[PDB]
């Protein structure tokens, strides 16, 4: 029963809206990923892990006016897109302590 | 640093929008309270505590179409409104285990 | 997967040890539960307990002092008018946060 | 007030005991940190550790077996090419969740 955790957020945030349903971008490559509504309380960076291989952190793109934010894999895979044959994992990085939390995954 | 808790919700909910900024309803009485956007994953009941005195739980009103939900204190104070001289506390009640979590307070 | 919440506690507490394995105490006659004891209880706050007997809220009472072996005992006689609770009813014991009044279920009998 | 998260752990774990008080191990010469030891570590999963030395990610290695007294030791020599880390750099030790790959800071040196 996770509701104590749920309402702890509600207690501390009061009002909060987020969408991390991922919008992956294609031909047999995944070039990027977009989140419709990201959290903005901190300047979060992102880490991409490609089929188990860690591509590191890069600095985030700006958050859009409709609240969306884009993670472009080309800045992470040295200019190449990633083949859908591989699994991809996208972590939010906490700029204060460097913690990272999985927020998206591809097969 | 509460962000691990924050992104645990994000992990498990992906998409989630809530507003518990309270809209208290008045002449020197607080008749009710409204939340603009409540959580709906469970049929949550509400408990009202009046200046330290516990008024118990009652069954919730339906959630509106714009996502709002109203807590009417008259069903809790035996028909009387509550005087603003008193502090009021409104708890969400988890219908599975009966846990309760403070979500609103008046002076 | 809730390891994030777990290690959020670990980072904030660094060192923490608890045991809320319920130890149900029987009265006289045996078919009466008159207490609950926890081997090790969190002590960062003076927590309180609420007992709910077969749907009926017996209310909140201040919690007995913590024992030297870290244990604490909820005495049902304080909540149920000097009688223990028949062991056919379901009993629920909530921990009450003295600061905000939140309550969290920690023990339940049938 | 985060007692809700706390008692969410208590309800799920019932019984739990940990100590991540860092015990920094010095090498030769003394001005080198070559290990970190934790007196009691969570064992519900085979956790892994990542060391970050003065901003440089030394990566993830599998964690030494847990000792009989519940303790576990992160050996920096495994991450830093057989040399210990100069105690003027800041060292960060993250716990890695083997299931999803999340990482949580548990220790930090200056």
Author numbering:
A (entry chain B), B (entry chain B): 5 to 30, 34 to 114
C (entry chain A), D (entry chain A): 5 to 114
Paper passage:
Fungal immunomodulatory proteins (FIPs) are a group of low-molecular-weight (MW) proteins investigated as potential anti-tumor drugs. FIP-nha (from Nectria haematococca) contains two glycosylation sites at positions N5 and N39. In this study, the impact of glycosylation on the bioactivity and biochemical characteristics of FIP-nha (from Nectria haematococca) is described. Taken together, these findings indicate that glycosylation of FIP-nha impacts its thermostability and digestion resistance.
To study the impact of glycosylation on functionality of rFIP-nha, two single mutants (N5A and N39A) and one double mutant (N5+39A) were constructed to remove glycosylation sites. The SDS-PAGE results showed that the purified WT, N5A and N39A were partially glycosylated, while the N5+39A variant was indeed unglycosylated. However, we only managed to obtain crystals and solved the structures of WT, N39A and N5+39A. Unfortunately, none of the structures contained a density indicative of N-glycosylation. SLS and native-PAGE results suggested that rFIP-nha and its variants were all homogeneously tetrameric in the solution. The Tm values for WT, N5A, N39A and N5+39A were 82.2 °C, 81.4 °C, 80.7 °C and 80.1 °C, respectively. The stability of rFIP-nha during pepsin digestion was in this order: WT (T1/2 11.6 min) > N39A (T1/2 1.9 min) > N5A (T1/2 1.3 min) > N5+39A (T1/2 0.5 min). Double glycosylation significantly enhanced the pepsin resistance. Resistance to trypsin digestion is shown in Figure 6: N5A (T1/2 longer than 240 min) > WT (T1/2 89.3 min) > N5+39A (T1/2 13.9 min) > N39A (T1/2 8.1 min). Interestingly, 39N-glycosylation contributed to trypsin resistance, while 5N-glycosylation did not contribute to this resistance. Thus, both glycan chains appeared to be able to shield pepsin cleavage sites, possibly by steric hindrance, explaining the observed decrease in pepsin resistance in all mutants.
